[PDB]
Design a protein around this ligand. Sequence first.
Ligand SMILES: [Cl-]
Ligand SMILES: [Cl-]
Ligand SMILES: [Cl-]
Length: 124
Amino acid sequence: KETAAAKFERQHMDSSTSAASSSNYCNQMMKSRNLTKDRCKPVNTFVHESLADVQAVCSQKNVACKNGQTNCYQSYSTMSITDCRETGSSKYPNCAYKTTQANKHIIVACEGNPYVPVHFDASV
Ligand SMILES: [Cl-]
Ligand SMILES: [Cl-]
Ligand SMILES: [Cl-]
């Protein structure tokens, strides 16, 4: 089974580009991070910052998570992110995603020793 920290990395980190370059970014990334294997994951955010910068959020501003847990953290700075969401035309195994690039604060839930991100809660 994948660890929670490793699943967060796979689903949410994309440190190799500064920003989405095209409308096809999400289609490509959702496929290659294996988020369309048996079903189309409906929504997923990628963060275009170093792993170290995202991990550092776990010692930044403690905020409530949407679900009422208290282990969420909001980045002090905005980060380059891309939101991927299925469009009307999406139908497994032919998933189809809208790509929306933005620069926003991220909010992550953190757990463990080391205390690292395990869920992406939201952007602001
Ligand atoms: Cl791990
Ligand atoms: Cl995988
Ligand atoms: Cl997400």
